[PDB]
Protein backbone atom coordinates (compact mmCIF):
# COMPACT_ATOMS: atom_id res chain seq x y z
CA UNK A 1 0.00 0.00 0.00
CA UNK A 2 1.06 3.66 -0.37
CA UNK A 3 0.39 6.60 1.97
CA UNK A 4 1.52 10.15 1.32
CA UNK A 5 0.76 13.86 0.99
CA UNK A 6 -0.22 15.56 -2.28
CA UNK A 7 0.60 19.31 -2.16
CA UNK A 8 -1.86 21.67 -3.90
CA UNK A 9 1.10 23.81 -5.17
CA UNK A 10 2.84 20.78 -6.87
CA UNK A 11 2.05 21.18 -10.63
CA UNK A 12 3.87 17.89 -11.52
CA UNK A 13 1.94 15.93 -8.80
CA UNK A 14 3.44 13.10 -6.63
CA UNK A 15 4.48 9.81 -8.27
CA UNK A 16 3.42 7.00 -5.86
CA UNK A 17 5.03 3.54 -5.44
CA UNK A 18 1.82 1.92 -6.91
CA UNK A 19 2.20 0.40 -10.39
CA UNK A 20 -1.29 -0.31 -11.74
CA UNK A 21 -1.01 -3.64 -13.65
CA UNK A 22 -3.62 -5.37 -15.86
CA UNK A 23 -6.24 -7.06 -13.62
CA UNK A 24 -5.42 -4.96 -10.54
CA UNK A 25 -8.29 -3.69 -8.32
CA UNK A 26 -7.46 -0.60 -6.21
CA UNK A 27 -8.93 1.41 -3.30
CA UNK A 28 -8.03 5.12 -2.67
CA UNK A 29 -9.10 7.22 0.35
CA UNK A 30 -8.20 10.99 0.25
CA UNK A 31 -8.69 13.54 3.10
CA UNK A 32 -7.70 17.11 3.98
CA UNK A 33 -8.02 20.74 2.95
CA UNK A 34 -6.42 22.67 0.07
CA UNK A 35 -6.85 25.88 -1.98
CA UNK A 36 -6.23 26.85 -5.62
CA UNK A 37 -5.69 30.49 -4.48
CA UNK A 38 -8.41 31.81 -2.09
CA UNK A 39 -7.90 31.84 1.72
CA UNK A 40 -10.90 29.40 1.92
CA UNK A 41 -10.00 25.67 1.61
CA UNK A 42 -11.95 22.78 -0.03
CA UNK A 43 -11.86 19.02 0.38
CA UNK A 44 -10.75 16.48 -2.25
CA UNK A 45 -13.91 17.01 -4.41
CA UNK A 46 -12.76 20.67 -4.78
CA UNK A 47 -14.99 23.76 -5.27
CA UNK A 48 -18.26 22.97 -7.10
CA UNK A 49 -18.92 26.75 -7.72
CA UNK A 50 -15.60 27.54 -9.56
CA UNK A 51 -15.69 27.58 -13.38
CA UNK A 52 -13.24 25.41 -15.39
CA UNK A 53 -10.73 27.87 -17.02
CA UNK A 54 -8.41 25.09 -18.39
CA UNK A 55 -8.12 22.53 -15.54
CA UNK A 56 -5.87 19.45 -16.11
CA UNK A 57 -9.06 17.35 -15.47
CA UNK A 58 -12.38 18.55 -17.03
CA UNK A 59 -14.34 15.75 -15.22
CA UNK A 60 -13.52 17.09 -11.69
CA UNK A 61 -13.96 20.51 -10.01
CA UNK A 62 -11.11 22.99 -9.49
CA UNK A 63 -9.19 21.83 -6.36
CA UNK A 64 -10.22 18.12 -6.69
CA UNK A 65 -7.75 15.24 -6.36
CA UNK A 66 -7.08 13.55 -9.72
CA UNK A 67 -4.57 10.99 -10.99
CA UNK A 68 -2.74 9.66 -14.04
CA UNK A 69 -1.90 5.97 -14.51
CA UNK A 70 1.26 5.69 -16.65
CA UNK A 71 0.79 7.91 -19.75
CA UNK A 72 -3.07 8.10 -19.27
CA UNK A 73 -5.18 11.26 -19.31
CA UNK A 74 -6.31 12.63 -15.92
CA UNK A 75 -8.84 10.47 -13.99
CA UNK A 76 -10.89 11.98 -11.14
CA UNK A 77 -10.14 10.55 -7.66
CA UNK A 78 -12.09 13.03 -5.49
CA UNK A 79 -12.60 11.52 -2.00
CA UNK A 80 -11.40 8.14 -3.41
CA UNK A 81 -12.23 4.97 -5.35
CA UNK A 82 -13.62 1.71 -3.95
CA UNK A 83 -12.40 -1.61 -5.49
CA UNK A 84 -11.95 0.20 -8.81
CA UNK A 85 -10.77 -1.24 -12.17
CA UNK A 86 -8.93 0.91 -14.73
CA UNK A 87 -9.95 1.21 -18.39
CA UNK A 88 -8.39 -1.49 -20.66
CA UNK A 89 -4.83 -0.39 -21.75
CA UNK A 90 -4.48 2.02 -18.79
CA UNK A 91 -1.36 0.79 -16.85
CA UNK A 92 1.76 2.07 -15.01
CA UNK A 93 2.76 4.23 -12.02
CA UNK A 94 -0.03 6.20 -10.31
CA UNK A 95 0.69 9.97 -10.09
CA UNK A 96 -1.62 12.03 -7.81
CA UNK A 97 -2.24 15.68 -8.81
CA UNK A 98 -4.25 18.63 -7.52
CA UNK A 99 -6.74 19.81 -10.21
CA UNK A 100 -5.82 23.44 -11.23
CA UNK A 101 -4.97 25.48 -14.38
CA UNK A 102 -1.38 24.74 -15.52
CA UNK A 103 1.03 27.59 -14.52
CA UNK A 104 -1.40 28.76 -11.70
CA UNK A 105 -0.19 26.29 -8.96
CA UNK A 106 2.22 28.84 -7.34
CA UNK A 107 -0.53 30.48 -5.18
CA UNK A 108 -2.04 27.12 -4.00
CA UNK A 109 -1.87 25.96 -0.36
CA UNK A 110 -2.49 22.88 1.80
CA UNK A 111 -2.54 19.24 0.75
CA UNK A 112 -4.43 15.93 0.78
CA UNK A 113 -3.45 12.83 2.82
CA UNK A 114 -3.95 9.81 0.49
CA UNK A 115 -3.95 6.05 0.97
CA UNK A 116 -3.81 3.63 -2.02
CA UNK A 117 -4.00 -0.16 -1.74
CA UNK A 118 -4.36 -3.11 -4.08
CA UNK A 119 -7.43 -5.23 -3.35
CA UNK A 120 -7.79 -9.01 -3.73
CA UNK A 121 -8.27 -10.17 -7.31
CA UNK B 1 -19.34 -5.16 1.04
CA UNK B 2 -22.16 -2.57 1.23
CA UNK B 3 -22.95 0.46 -0.99
CA UNK B 4 -25.75 2.95 -0.31
CA UNK B 5 -26.96 6.54 0.05
CA UNK B 6 -27.01 8.37 3.40
CA UNK B 7 -29.46 11.35 3.25
CA UNK B 8 -28.45 14.55 5.09
CA UNK B 9 -32.08 14.88 6.39
CA UNK B 10 -32.08 11.31 7.91
CA UNK B 11 -31.72 12.03 11.66
CA UNK B 12 -31.77 8.29 12.52
CA UNK B 13 -29.04 7.52 9.92
CA UNK B 14 -28.86 4.51 7.52
CA UNK B 15 -28.24 1.01 8.96
CA UNK B 16 -25.77 -0.75 6.59
CA UNK B 17 -25.27 -4.53 5.92
CA UNK B 18 -21.92 -4.37 7.79
CA UNK B 19 -21.68 -5.96 11.26
CA UNK B 20 -18.38 -4.78 12.72
CA UNK B 21 -16.92 -7.75 14.68
CA UNK B 22 -13.87 -7.71 16.97
CA UNK B 23 -10.64 -7.66 14.92
CA UNK B 24 -12.40 -6.61 11.65
CA UNK B 25 -10.43 -4.30 9.30
CA UNK B 26 -12.76 -2.08 7.22
CA UNK B 27 -12.40 0.50 4.44
CA UNK B 28 -15.05 3.23 3.89
CA UNK B 29 -15.16 5.63 0.91
CA UNK B 30 -17.77 8.48 0.99
CA UNK B 31 -18.56 10.90 -1.89
CA UNK B 32 -21.14 13.57 -2.69
CA UNK B 33 -22.64 16.90 -1.69
CA UNK B 34 -24.99 17.77 1.19
CA UNK B 35 -26.21 20.73 3.32
CA UNK B 36 -27.29 21.23 6.95
CA UNK B 37 -29.58 24.10 5.72
CA UNK B 38 -27.79 26.65 3.44
CA UNK B 39 -28.11 26.53 -0.40
CA UNK B 40 -24.28 25.92 -0.39
CA UNK B 41 -23.26 22.22 -0.22
CA UNK B 42 -20.20 20.55 1.39
CA UNK B 43 -18.46 17.20 0.97
CA UNK B 44 -18.24 14.44 3.57
CA UNK B 45 -15.77 16.41 5.77
CA UNK B 46 -18.55 19.04 6.16
CA UNK B 47 -18.15 22.81 6.74
CA UNK B 48 -14.80 23.71 8.38
CA UNK B 49 -16.05 27.31 9.11
CA UNK B 50 -19.30 26.42 11.01
CA UNK B 51 -19.30 26.52 14.83
CA UNK B 52 -20.38 23.37 16.77
CA UNK B 53 -23.84 24.32 18.23
CA UNK B 54 -24.57 20.82 19.73
CA UNK B 55 -23.59 18.32 16.94
CA UNK B 56 -24.14 14.53 17.44
CA UNK B 57 -20.33 14.23 16.84
CA UNK B 58 -18.10 16.91 18.47
CA UNK B 59 -15.00 15.46 16.72
CA UNK B 60 -16.24 16.22 13.14
CA UNK B 61 -17.52 19.40 11.44
CA UNK B 62 -21.22 20.15 10.88
CA UNK B 63 -22.22 18.31 7.66
CA UNK B 64 -19.53 15.56 8.02
CA UNK B 65 -20.32 11.85 7.65
CA UNK B 66 -20.13 9.99 11.00
CA UNK B 67 -21.10 6.49 12.20
CA UNK B 68 -22.18 4.40 15.17
CA UNK B 69 -21.11 0.76 15.58
CA UNK B 70 -23.85 -1.07 17.53
CA UNK B 71 -24.60 0.93 20.71
CA UNK B 72 -21.37 3.08 20.36
CA UNK B 73 -21.23 6.89 20.40
CA UNK B 74 -20.48 8.71 17.14
CA UNK B 75 -17.18 8.06 15.31
CA UNK B 76 -16.01 10.43 12.55
CA UNK B 77 -15.94 8.95 9.01
CA UNK B 78 -15.41 12.10 6.87
CA UNK B 79 -14.19 11.05 3.36
CA UNK B 80 -13.61 7.52 4.73
CA UNK B 81 -11.32 5.17 6.64
CA UNK B 82 -8.50 3.07 5.14
CA UNK B 83 -7.93 -0.45 6.64
CA UNK B 84 -9.31 0.78 9.98
CA UNK B 85 -9.70 -1.23 13.20
CA UNK B 86 -12.06 -0.12 16.00
CA UNK B 87 -11.03 -0.16 19.67
CA UNK B 88 -12.05 -3.54 21.23
CA UNK B 89 -15.08 -1.99 23.13
CA UNK B 90 -17.08 -1.55 19.85
CA UNK B 91 -19.11 -4.11 17.78
CA UNK B 92 -22.41 -4.46 15.86
CA UNK B 93 -24.14 -2.96 12.82
CA UNK B 94 -22.62 0.19 11.28
CA UNK B 95 -25.15 3.05 11.08
CA UNK B 96 -24.02 6.02 8.92
CA UNK B 97 -25.33 9.46 9.99
CA UNK B 98 -24.97 13.04 8.75
CA UNK B 99 -23.43 15.25 11.50
CA UNK B 100 -26.00 17.92 12.53
CA UNK B 101 -27.69 19.30 15.71
CA UNK B 102 -30.49 16.99 16.99
CA UNK B 103 -33.92 18.37 15.93
CA UNK B 104 -32.36 20.48 13.04
CA UNK B 105 -32.25 17.73 10.31
CA UNK B 106 -35.61 18.78 8.72
CA UNK B 107 -34.05 21.50 6.49
CA UNK B 108 -31.07 19.34 5.32
CA UNK B 109 -30.60 18.37 1.65
CA UNK B 110 -28.42 16.09 -0.50
CA UNK B 111 -26.70 12.83 0.42
CA UNK B 112 -23.44 10.90 0.39
CA UNK B 113 -22.79 7.70 -1.63
CA UNK B 114 -20.83 5.33 0.66
CA UNK B 115 -18.99 2.05 0.10
CA UNK B 116 -17.92 -0.13 3.10
CA UNK B 117 -15.96 -3.38 2.82
CA UNK B 118 -14.07 -5.76 5.09
CA UNK B 119 -10.33 -6.07 4.40
CA UNK B 120 -7.88 -8.98 4.87
CA UNK B 121 -6.87 -9.63 8.47
O1 LIG C 1 -12.48 5.53 -15.21
C1 LIG C 1 -13.05 6.51 -14.74
C2 LIG C 1 -13.75 6.49 -13.43
C3 LIG C 1 -13.51 7.56 -12.56
C4 LIG C 1 -14.17 7.66 -11.34
C5 LIG C 1 -15.07 6.68 -10.98
O2 LIG C 1 -15.70 6.82 -9.79
C6 LIG C 1 -15.34 5.62 -11.85
O3 LIG C 1 -16.27 4.66 -11.55
C7 LIG C 1 -14.70 5.54 -13.08
C8 LIG C 1 -12.90 7.79 -15.39
C9 LIG C 1 -13.71 8.91 -15.09
C10 LIG C 1 -13.51 10.12 -15.69
C11 LIG C 1 -12.43 10.25 -16.58
O4 LIG C 1 -12.15 11.43 -17.19
C12 LIG C 1 -11.62 9.18 -16.90
C13 LIG C 1 -11.84 7.97 -16.29
O5 LIG C 1 -11.04 6.94 -16.63
O1 LIG D 1 -13.49 4.92 18.79
C1 LIG D 1 -14.18 5.89 19.12
C2 LIG D 1 -15.38 5.64 19.98
C3 LIG D 1 -16.48 6.50 20.10
C4 LIG D 1 -17.57 6.18 20.90
C5 LIG D 1 -17.58 4.99 21.61
O2 LIG D 1 -18.57 4.53 22.41
C6 LIG D 1 -16.50 4.12 21.50
O3 LIG D 1 -16.62 2.98 22.24
C7 LIG D 1 -15.40 4.43 20.70
C8 LIG D 1 -13.84 7.26 18.57
C9 LIG D 1 -14.30 8.47 19.12
C10 LIG D 1 -13.98 9.70 18.61
C11 LIG D 1 -13.13 9.79 17.51
O4 LIG D 1 -12.87 11.07 17.09
C12 LIG D 1 -12.65 8.62 16.92
C13 LIG D 1 -13.01 7.37 17.44
O5 LIG D 1 -12.58 6.19 16.87
CA1 LIG E 1 -4.04 28.43 -8.40
CA1 LIG F 1 -30.04 21.51 9.57
mmCIF file of C-alpha atoms and ligand atoms in Angstrom:
data_model
loop_
_atom_site.group_PDB
_atom_site.id
_atom_site.type_symbol
_atom_site.label_atom_id
_atom_site.label_comp_id
_atom_site.label_asym_id
_atom_site.label_seq_id
_atom_site.Cartn_x
_atom_site.Cartn_y
_atom_site.Cartn_z
ATOM 1 C CA UNK A 1 0.000 0.000 0.000
ATOM 2 C CA UNK A 2 1.057 3.657 -0.374
ATOM 3 C CA UNK A 3 0.385 6.601 1.970
ATOM 4 C CA UNK A 4 1.519 10.147 1.322
ATOM 5 C CA UNK A 5 0.763 13.864 0.993
ATOM 6 C CA UNK A 6 -0.220 15.559 -2.278
ATOM 7 C CA UNK A 7 0.599 19.314 -2.158
ATOM 8 C CA UNK A 8 -1.860 21.667 -3.903
ATOM 9 C CA UNK A 9 1.098 23.806 -5.166
ATOM 10 C CA UNK A 10 2.843 20.783 -6.869
ATOM 11 C CA UNK A 11 2.051 21.184 -10.625
ATOM 12 C CA UNK A 12 3.867 17.894 -11.517
ATOM 13 C CA UNK A 13 1.938 15.933 -8.802
ATOM 14 C CA UNK A 14 3.438 13.096 -6.633
ATOM 15 C CA UNK A 15 4.476 9.807 -8.274
ATOM 16 C CA UNK A 16 3.420 6.995 -5.864
ATOM 17 C CA UNK A 17 5.031 3.536 -5.436
ATOM 18 C CA UNK A 18 1.824 1.923 -6.910
ATOM 19 C CA UNK A 19 2.196 0.404 -10.394
ATOM 20 C CA UNK A 20 -1.294 -0.315 -11.742
ATOM 21 C CA UNK A 21 -1.012 -3.639 -13.652
ATOM 22 C CA UNK A 22 -3.617 -5.369 -15.864
ATOM 23 C CA UNK A 23 -6.236 -7.062 -13.624
ATOM 24 C CA UNK A 24 -5.421 -4.956 -10.539
ATOM 25 C CA UNK A 25 -8.289 -3.692 -8.317
ATOM 26 C CA UNK A 26 -7.455 -0.597 -6.206
ATOM 27 C CA UNK A 27 -8.929 1.407 -3.304
ATOM 28 C CA UNK A 28 -8.026 5.115 -2.669
ATOM 29 C CA UNK A 29 -9.096 7.223 0.348
ATOM 30 C CA UNK A 30 -8.199 10.991 0.253
ATOM 31 C CA UNK A 31 -8.689 13.541 3.101
ATOM 32 C CA UNK A 32 -7.696 17.108 3.982
ATOM 33 C CA UNK A 33 -8.017 20.744 2.949
ATOM 34 C CA UNK A 34 -6.423 22.672 0.074
ATOM 35 C CA UNK A 35 -6.850 25.880 -1.978
ATOM 36 C CA UNK A 36 -6.230 26.846 -5.615
ATOM 37 C CA UNK A 37 -5.693 30.494 -4.477
ATOM 38 C CA UNK A 38 -8.414 31.806 -2.092
ATOM 39 C CA UNK A 39 -7.896 31.840 1.723
ATOM 40 C CA UNK A 40 -10.898 29.397 1.917
ATOM 41 C CA UNK A 41 -10.004 25.667 1.613
ATOM 42 C CA UNK A 42 -11.952 22.785 -0.034
ATOM 43 C CA UNK A 43 -11.864 19.016 0.379
ATOM 44 C CA UNK A 44 -10.755 16.481 -2.248
ATOM 45 C CA UNK A 45 -13.912 17.011 -4.408
ATOM 46 C CA UNK A 46 -12.763 20.673 -4.776
ATOM 47 C CA UNK A 47 -14.987 23.764 -5.266
ATOM 48 C CA UNK A 48 -18.259 22.975 -7.098
ATOM 49 C CA UNK A 49 -18.921 26.747 -7.721
ATOM 50 C CA UNK A 50 -15.599 27.541 -9.558
ATOM 51 C CA UNK A 51 -15.686 27.577 -13.382
ATOM 52 C CA UNK A 52 -13.238 25.409 -15.388
ATOM 53 C CA UNK A 53 -10.732 27.868 -17.022
ATOM 54 C CA UNK A 54 -8.409 25.092 -18.390
ATOM 55 C CA UNK A 55 -8.119 22.527 -15.541
ATOM 56 C CA UNK A 56 -5.865 19.446 -16.106
ATOM 57 C CA UNK A 57 -9.064 17.348 -15.467
ATOM 58 C CA UNK A 58 -12.380 18.547 -17.032
ATOM 59 C CA UNK A 59 -14.335 15.746 -15.218
ATOM 60 C CA UNK A 60 -13.523 17.090 -11.693
ATOM 61 C CA UNK A 61 -13.959 20.507 -10.011
ATOM 62 C CA UNK A 62 -11.108 22.986 -9.486
ATOM 63 C CA UNK A 63 -9.188 21.834 -6.356
ATOM 64 C CA UNK A 64 -10.225 18.122 -6.687
ATOM 65 C CA UNK A 65 -7.752 15.236 -6.363
ATOM 66 C CA UNK A 66 -7.078 13.546 -9.719
ATOM 67 C CA UNK A 67 -4.574 10.991 -10.991
ATOM 68 C CA UNK A 68 -2.736 9.658 -14.036
ATOM 69 C CA UNK A 69 -1.895 5.965 -14.507
ATOM 70 C CA UNK A 70 1.262 5.694 -16.649
ATOM 71 C CA UNK A 71 0.788 7.915 -19.753
ATOM 72 C CA UNK A 72 -3.069 8.104 -19.271
ATOM 73 C CA UNK A 73 -5.184 11.255 -19.315
ATOM 74 C CA UNK A 74 -6.313 12.625 -15.917
ATOM 75 C CA UNK A 75 -8.838 10.469 -13.992
ATOM 76 C CA UNK A 76 -10.890 11.982 -11.142
ATOM 77 C CA UNK A 77 -10.137 10.551 -7.660
ATOM 78 C CA UNK A 78 -12.092 13.029 -5.494
ATOM 79 C CA UNK A 79 -12.596 11.525 -2.005
ATOM 80 C CA UNK A 80 -11.405 8.142 -3.406
ATOM 81 C CA UNK A 81 -12.231 4.966 -5.345
ATOM 82 C CA UNK A 82 -13.622 1.713 -3.951
ATOM 83 C CA UNK A 83 -12.404 -1.606 -5.493
ATOM 84 C CA UNK A 84 -11.949 0.205 -8.814
ATOM 85 C CA UNK A 85 -10.766 -1.236 -12.170
ATOM 86 C CA UNK A 86 -8.935 0.911 -14.730
ATOM 87 C CA UNK A 87 -9.954 1.214 -18.393
ATOM 88 C CA UNK A 88 -8.388 -1.493 -20.657
ATOM 89 C CA UNK A 89 -4.833 -0.386 -21.747
ATOM 90 C CA UNK A 90 -4.477 2.023 -18.793
ATOM 91 C CA UNK A 91 -1.359 0.795 -16.855
ATOM 92 C CA UNK A 92 1.760 2.075 -15.007
ATOM 93 C CA UNK A 93 2.756 4.227 -12.015
ATOM 94 C CA UNK A 94 -0.029 6.200 -10.306
ATOM 95 C CA UNK A 95 0.685 9.973 -10.094
ATOM 96 C CA UNK A 96 -1.620 12.029 -7.809
ATOM 97 C CA UNK A 97 -2.240 15.676 -8.809
ATOM 98 C CA UNK A 98 -4.245 18.635 -7.518
ATOM 99 C CA UNK A 99 -6.741 19.808 -10.210
ATOM 100 C CA UNK A 100 -5.816 23.435 -11.229
ATOM 101 C CA UNK A 101 -4.973 25.482 -14.384
ATOM 102 C CA UNK A 102 -1.376 24.744 -15.518
ATOM 103 C CA UNK A 103 1.028 27.587 -14.523
ATOM 104 C CA UNK A 104 -1.401 28.757 -11.699
ATOM 105 C CA UNK A 105 -0.194 26.291 -8.959
ATOM 106 C CA UNK A 106 2.222 28.839 -7.336
ATOM 107 C CA UNK A 107 -0.530 30.482 -5.181
ATOM 108 C CA UNK A 108 -2.037 27.123 -4.002
ATOM 109 C CA UNK A 109 -1.871 25.963 -0.358
ATOM 110 C CA UNK A 110 -2.489 22.877 1.799
ATOM 111 C CA UNK A 111 -2.544 19.238 0.745
ATOM 112 C CA UNK A 112 -4.429 15.930 0.782
ATOM 113 C CA UNK A 113 -3.448 12.831 2.823
ATOM 114 C CA UNK A 114 -3.946 9.813 0.489
ATOM 115 C CA UNK A 115 -3.952 6.045 0.975
ATOM 116 C CA UNK A 116 -3.815 3.630 -2.019
ATOM 117 C CA UNK A 117 -3.996 -0.165 -1.736
ATOM 118 C CA UNK A 118 -4.363 -3.113 -4.084
ATOM 119 C CA UNK A 119 -7.429 -5.230 -3.353
ATOM 120 C CA UNK A 120 -7.793 -9.014 -3.727
ATOM 121 C CA UNK A 121 -8.272 -10.173 -7.309
ATOM 122 C CA UNK B 1 -19.338 -5.163 1.035
ATOM 123 C CA UNK B 2 -22.155 -2.566 1.228
ATOM 124 C CA UNK B 3 -22.947 0.460 -0.988
ATOM 125 C CA UNK B 4 -25.750 2.949 -0.307
ATOM 126 C CA UNK B 5 -26.959 6.545 0.049
ATOM 127 C CA UNK B 6 -27.014 8.373 3.397
ATOM 128 C CA UNK B 7 -29.455 11.352 3.246
ATOM 129 C CA UNK B 8 -28.452 14.547 5.093
ATOM 130 C CA UNK B 9 -32.077 14.882 6.386
ATOM 131 C CA UNK B 10 -32.084 11.311 7.906
ATOM 132 C CA UNK B 11 -31.718 12.030 11.664
ATOM 133 C CA UNK B 12 -31.767 8.287 12.524
ATOM 134 C CA UNK B 13 -29.035 7.518 9.919
ATOM 135 C CA UNK B 14 -28.855 4.507 7.515
ATOM 136 C CA UNK B 15 -28.242 1.014 8.960
ATOM 137 C CA UNK B 16 -25.767 -0.750 6.595
ATOM 138 C CA UNK B 17 -25.270 -4.528 5.925
ATOM 139 C CA UNK B 18 -21.916 -4.373 7.789
ATOM 140 C CA UNK B 19 -21.680 -5.955 11.257
ATOM 141 C CA UNK B 20 -18.379 -4.775 12.724
ATOM 142 C CA UNK B 21 -16.923 -7.746 14.680
ATOM 143 C CA UNK B 22 -13.870 -7.709 16.967
ATOM 144 C CA UNK B 23 -10.640 -7.663 14.916
ATOM 145 C CA UNK B 24 -12.398 -6.609 11.646
ATOM 146 C CA UNK B 25 -10.431 -4.303 9.300
ATOM 147 C CA UNK B 26 -12.759 -2.083 7.223
ATOM 148 C CA UNK B 27 -12.403 0.497 4.437
ATOM 149 C CA UNK B 28 -15.053 3.234 3.892
ATOM 150 C CA UNK B 29 -15.161 5.630 0.913
ATOM 151 C CA UNK B 30 -17.774 8.479 0.994
ATOM 152 C CA UNK B 31 -18.563 10.898 -1.893
ATOM 153 C CA UNK B 32 -21.141 13.565 -2.689
ATOM 154 C CA UNK B 33 -22.640 16.904 -1.693
ATOM 155 C CA UNK B 34 -24.987 17.769 1.189
ATOM 156 C CA UNK B 35 -26.210 20.732 3.323
ATOM 157 C CA UNK B 36 -27.286 21.229 6.949
ATOM 158 C CA UNK B 37 -29.578 24.099 5.718
ATOM 159 C CA UNK B 38 -27.790 26.653 3.445
ATOM 160 C CA UNK B 39 -28.109 26.533 -0.400
ATOM 161 C CA UNK B 40 -24.283 25.922 -0.392
ATOM 162 C CA UNK B 41 -23.260 22.217 -0.220
ATOM 163 C CA UNK B 42 -20.198 20.555 1.386
ATOM 164 C CA UNK B 43 -18.464 17.203 0.970
ATOM 165 C CA UNK B 44 -18.241 14.436 3.569
ATOM 166 C CA UNK B 45 -15.768 16.411 5.774
ATOM 167 C CA UNK B 46 -18.549 19.040 6.157
ATOM 168 C CA UNK B 47 -18.155 22.808 6.742
ATOM 169 C CA UNK B 48 -14.804 23.712 8.383
ATOM 170 C CA UNK B 49 -16.050 27.314 9.111
ATOM 171 C CA UNK B 50 -19.301 26.421 11.012
ATOM 172 C CA UNK B 51 -19.304 26.517 14.829
ATOM 173 C CA UNK B 52 -20.385 23.367 16.767
ATOM 174 C CA UNK B 53 -23.841 24.316 18.235
ATOM 175 C CA UNK B 54 -24.571 20.822 19.732
ATOM 176 C CA UNK B 55 -23.590 18.324 16.945
ATOM 177 C CA UNK B 56 -24.138 14.535 17.439
ATOM 178 C CA UNK B 57 -20.330 14.231 16.843
ATOM 179 C CA UNK B 58 -18.102 16.914 18.475
ATOM 180 C CA UNK B 59 -14.997 15.461 16.720
ATOM 181 C CA UNK B 60 -16.237 16.222 13.142
ATOM 182 C CA UNK B 61 -17.518 19.404 11.439
ATOM 183 C CA UNK B 62 -21.215 20.154 10.881
ATOM 184 C CA UNK B 63 -22.220 18.306 7.664
ATOM 185 C CA UNK B 64 -19.531 15.561 8.019
ATOM 186 C CA UNK B 65 -20.317 11.851 7.654
ATOM 187 C CA UNK B 66 -20.131 9.990 10.996
ATOM 188 C CA UNK B 67 -21.102 6.494 12.199
ATOM 189 C CA UNK B 68 -22.181 4.404 15.167
ATOM 190 C CA UNK B 69 -21.111 0.764 15.582
ATOM 191 C CA UNK B 70 -23.852 -1.071 17.527
ATOM 192 C CA UNK B 71 -24.599 0.930 20.714
ATOM 193 C CA UNK B 72 -21.369 3.085 20.358
ATOM 194 C CA UNK B 73 -21.226 6.886 20.397
ATOM 195 C CA UNK B 74 -20.483 8.710 17.144
ATOM 196 C CA UNK B 75 -17.178 8.060 15.315
ATOM 197 C CA UNK B 76 -16.009 10.434 12.547
ATOM 198 C CA UNK B 77 -15.939 8.948 9.007
ATOM 199 C CA UNK B 78 -15.414 12.099 6.873
ATOM 200 C CA UNK B 79 -14.194 11.053 3.357
ATOM 201 C CA UNK B 80 -13.609 7.518 4.732
ATOM 202 C CA UNK B 81 -11.316 5.174 6.641
ATOM 203 C CA UNK B 82 -8.499 3.071 5.140
ATOM 204 C CA UNK B 83 -7.930 -0.454 6.636
ATOM 205 C CA UNK B 84 -9.311 0.781 9.979
ATOM 206 C CA UNK B 85 -9.696 -1.235 13.200
ATOM 207 C CA UNK B 86 -12.064 -0.124 15.997
ATOM 208 C CA UNK B 87 -11.034 -0.159 19.667
ATOM 209 C CA UNK B 88 -12.049 -3.541 21.227
ATOM 210 C CA UNK B 89 -15.076 -1.987 23.130
ATOM 211 C CA UNK B 90 -17.079 -1.548 19.852
ATOM 212 C CA UNK B 91 -19.107 -4.112 17.781
ATOM 213 C CA UNK B 92 -22.408 -4.464 15.862
ATOM 214 C CA UNK B 93 -24.136 -2.960 12.823
ATOM 215 C CA UNK B 94 -22.618 0.188 11.277
ATOM 216 C CA UNK B 95 -25.150 3.048 11.077
ATOM 217 C CA UNK B 96 -24.024 6.016 8.919
ATOM 218 C CA UNK B 97 -25.330 9.462 9.988
ATOM 219 C CA UNK B 98 -24.971 13.037 8.753
ATOM 220 C CA UNK B 99 -23.429 15.253 11.504
ATOM 221 C CA UNK B 100 -25.997 17.924 12.534
ATOM 222 C CA UNK B 101 -27.687 19.298 15.711
ATOM 223 C CA UNK B 102 -30.490 16.993 16.990
ATOM 224 C CA UNK B 103 -33.925 18.371 15.929
ATOM 225 C CA UNK B 104 -32.364 20.482 13.040
ATOM 226 C CA UNK B 105 -32.246 17.726 10.307
ATOM 227 C CA UNK B 106 -35.608 18.776 8.717
ATOM 228 C CA UNK B 107 -34.045 21.496 6.489
ATOM 229 C CA UNK B 108 -31.071 19.339 5.325
ATOM 230 C CA UNK B 109 -30.602 18.372 1.647
ATOM 231 C CA UNK B 110 -28.416 16.094 -0.497
ATOM 232 C CA UNK B 111 -26.700 12.830 0.424
ATOM 233 C CA UNK B 112 -23.436 10.901 0.390
ATOM 234 C CA UNK B 113 -22.791 7.704 -1.631
ATOM 235 C CA UNK B 114 -20.833 5.327 0.660
ATOM 236 C CA UNK B 115 -18.986 2.047 0.103
ATOM 237 C CA UNK B 116 -17.916 -0.135 3.104
ATOM 238 C CA UNK B 117 -15.960 -3.381 2.817
ATOM 239 C CA UNK B 118 -14.073 -5.759 5.087
ATOM 240 C CA UNK B 119 -10.327 -6.066 4.405
ATOM 241 C CA UNK B 120 -7.875 -8.977 4.872
ATOM 242 C CA UNK B 121 -6.872 -9.627 8.469
HETATM 243 O O1 LIG C 1 -12.479 5.526 -15.212
HETATM 244 C C1 LIG C 1 -13.048 6.508 -14.744
HETATM 245 C C2 LIG C 1 -13.746 6.493 -13.434
HETATM 246 C C3 LIG C 1 -13.508 7.560 -12.557
HETATM 247 C C4 LIG C 1 -14.166 7.665 -11.341
HETATM 248 C C5 LIG C 1 -15.067 6.684 -10.984
HETATM 249 O O2 LIG C 1 -15.701 6.824 -9.791
HETATM 250 C C6 LIG C 1 -15.344 5.619 -11.854
HETATM 251 O O3 LIG C 1 -16.271 4.658 -11.546
HETATM 252 C C7 LIG C 1 -14.704 5.538 -13.078
HETATM 253 C C8 LIG C 1 -12.900 7.794 -15.391
HETATM 254 C C9 LIG C 1 -13.711 8.907 -15.086
HETATM 255 C C10 LIG C 1 -13.506 10.115 -15.693
HETATM 256 C C11 LIG C 1 -12.433 10.248 -16.585
HETATM 257 O O4 LIG C 1 -12.155 11.428 -17.189
HETATM 258 C C12 LIG C 1 -11.617 9.183 -16.896
HETATM 259 C C13 LIG C 1 -11.841 7.970 -16.289
HETATM 260 O O5 LIG C 1 -11.039 6.940 -16.626
HETATM 261 O O1 LIG C 2 -13.488 4.924 18.791
HETATM 262 C C1 LIG C 2 -14.185 5.889 19.116
HETATM 263 C C2 LIG C 2 -15.379 5.637 19.980
HETATM 264 C C3 LIG C 2 -16.480 6.498 20.101
HETATM 265 C C4 LIG C 2 -17.570 6.183 20.903
HETATM 266 C C5 LIG C 2 -17.578 4.994 21.606
HETATM 267 O O2 LIG C 2 -18.570 4.531 22.413
HETATM 268 C C6 LIG C 2 -16.500 4.122 21.504
HETATM 269 O O3 LIG C 2 -16.625 2.983 22.244
HETATM 270 C C7 LIG C 2 -15.404 4.433 20.700
HETATM 271 C C8 LIG C 2 -13.841 7.263 18.571
HETATM 272 C C9 LIG C 2 -14.301 8.470 19.123
HETATM 273 C C10 LIG C 2 -13.977 9.700 18.610
HETATM 274 C C11 LIG C 2 -13.132 9.795 17.508
HETATM 275 O O4 LIG C 2 -12.870 11.071 17.092
HETATM 276 C C12 LIG C 2 -12.649 8.622 16.917
HETATM 277 C C13 LIG C 2 -13.013 7.367 17.436
HETATM 278 O O5 LIG C 2 -12.576 6.189 16.868
HETATM 279 CA CA1 LIG C 3 -4.035 28.429 -8.400
HETATM 280 CA CA1 LIG C 4 -30.038 21.506 9.572
#
